[model samples]
Each structure stands twice: as C-alpha cells, then as structure tokens.
Target: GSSGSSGMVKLFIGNLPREATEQEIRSLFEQYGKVLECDIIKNYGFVHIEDKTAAEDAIRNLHHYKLHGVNINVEASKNKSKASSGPSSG
Candidate 1:
C-alpha cells in the first residue's frame, strides 16, 4: 500500500545471498533512474528504497532478477516510522 503524501515508495527485497552488498542493490536499480538510496539489511534486516517512482519501476522490471542462487522478492516497503523518531528509526 502507498500513501499519496510521502509519494516515496519503499521496497522490501528478501532472499538476498549472504554476500549481497549495497552497491549490488544500487546497481540493480540504477537502470530505473536515480536509485536515491540502497541499503541491504543484515540477516533479519531489510533493504530500504526512498523513490516511489523507482519502487514502482523496479517492481515492473526487476520482478525476475536471479540472484543469491534464487529469484529475490520485491514488494512495497512497509517499515514506516514515527515522524518524531530519529534517523535510526528509519
């Protein structure tokens, strides 16, 4: 689900290989347009993407990327934090 206000869409990419890196994620979405930012979370962690348009574009294009010895999953990121929270909250 996406809100019309923030306009930025988040993407949760899971099943990443234990060796995946932020650069790899950024390069994965660079074909879309300005990836904005790419952070691959640690085990139990998750990646965060800020560009809504890029998120949608990624969903349309990267639905079939073969990585980590398997196809990774992509969906709208849902880890929304409170407005009064600090940077770590993100």
Candidate 2:
C-alpha cells in the first residue's frame, strides 16, 4: 500500500542562468510531467513536480541541460528548515 502523504516531489535547481525565468523552468520540467509550482530566486530556484517519477526524470535530464551558456544542477531539495548557506558552486 502507498503512504498517505502527498506524493509531490520538490527539487532544487542550482547554477541557473541569470536570464532563466519561472515560465522557462516550468516549461522545461513540464516536458516530463506536470509542474505543481516553480519559484526562482536570483540564480537559484525550486520546482515542485507532481510525482516522484516525473521529478526523477526532470532531475536526470535537466541536470545536463545547458541554457544561456550555463549548465544547471538539479536534485532533491533539502528541508526548508535547513537554511541554505549560500548559492551553490557548479
């Protein structure tokens, strides 16, 4: 049996190009599956994908995707309670 909690998966996108936008991120992730939400802050952002499988696909594919001459990194996001020290390098 499946757990009762929401299956939505949250992801972290680092090293985003300065030109990247919410709509662009949303569109990119949507190629794999539904995007629940997208939030960009400067050169970093968070994307909430509708499911684990979709999230995995997005992370695997998007990690190597180069945009605006920059290669971004995608992975599972840390708990909100764990404050990020600063922008990630690479």
Candidate 3:
C-alpha cells in the first residue's frame, strides 16, 4: 500500500524531466525551507518537505514554472491539510 503514514509532509512531484536532477530541483524547494531530505526517482518521485507552511510556499513558488518546456506539478501528499490557520495554537 502506498498510503502509509509518514512523518513530516510528503509531496508528489509530477512530470519531472530527465534533465532535472534531484539536487537541482531539491535546490529549488530548499528556498521555501530546509529540504532536510529528498526521494528522487526517474520520471516522478516523492519529496519530503520540512514544514507545513513551507510546503504551501513551495507549491506557491514552484507549482507552476517552466522546466524542460513542461509545466511540472508539485502536489502535497495529503487528502486534507492541517495547521496554517492558527499560529502555534496546537
């Protein structure tokens, strides 16, 4: 099953081109926050973001960008989102 609960926020990276290296894309995501870790595979791969709000920012900045002439998709790996409304309320 691909629905196992994991720590932190996992992201589904779509349409990643072969020319794009994990460190290259990983560098892009690191701008939002510390990437901490990355899972890179051919074609598509899963990304483990460091924070919740940072994840949103990652999507905001990197969601729609020209890469290899293909509009890539960075999807957060969650049916519903958590936190971000309140600041340290939890």
The model with the greatest TM-score is 2
Give the range where candidate 1 is weakest over 10 consecutive residues by summed lDDT. Answer: 42-51
Residue-by-residue lDDT tens digits, candidate 1, 13-59: 77777767877777777777456556766542233445555667766
Report model 1's TM-score to 2 decimal places. Answer: 0.61
C-alpha TM-score for every candidate: 0.61, 0.76, 0.73
CA lDDT, every model vs. true structure: 0.63, 0.81, 0.74
TM-score of model number 3: 0.73
Worst 10 residues of 2 by lDDT: 78-87
**Global Cα lDDT for candidate 1:** 0.63
Which structure among the candidates has the greatest lDDT? Answer: 2
The lowest-lDDT stretch of 10 consecutive residues in candidate 3 is 1-10
Report RMSD (Å) for each prediction in the order shown. Answer: 8.5, 9.7, 7.0
Name the lDDT value of residue 42 in candidate 1. 54
Q: For model 2, how does the per-residue alpha-carbon lDDT over 1-90 read when each residue is reduced to its tens digit?
A: 035245778889989887899999998999998888899986789998886767777888898698888888888773324338866564
Off by over 4 Å in 3: 1-7, 81-90
In candidate 1, stretches whose alpha carbon ends up further than 4 angstroms from where it belongs are 1-7, 44-51, 78-90
| C-alpha positional error of residue 60 in candidate 1 after TM-score superposition, expressed in Å | 2.6
Please identify model 2 stretches exceeding 4 Å from their true place: 1-5, 78-90
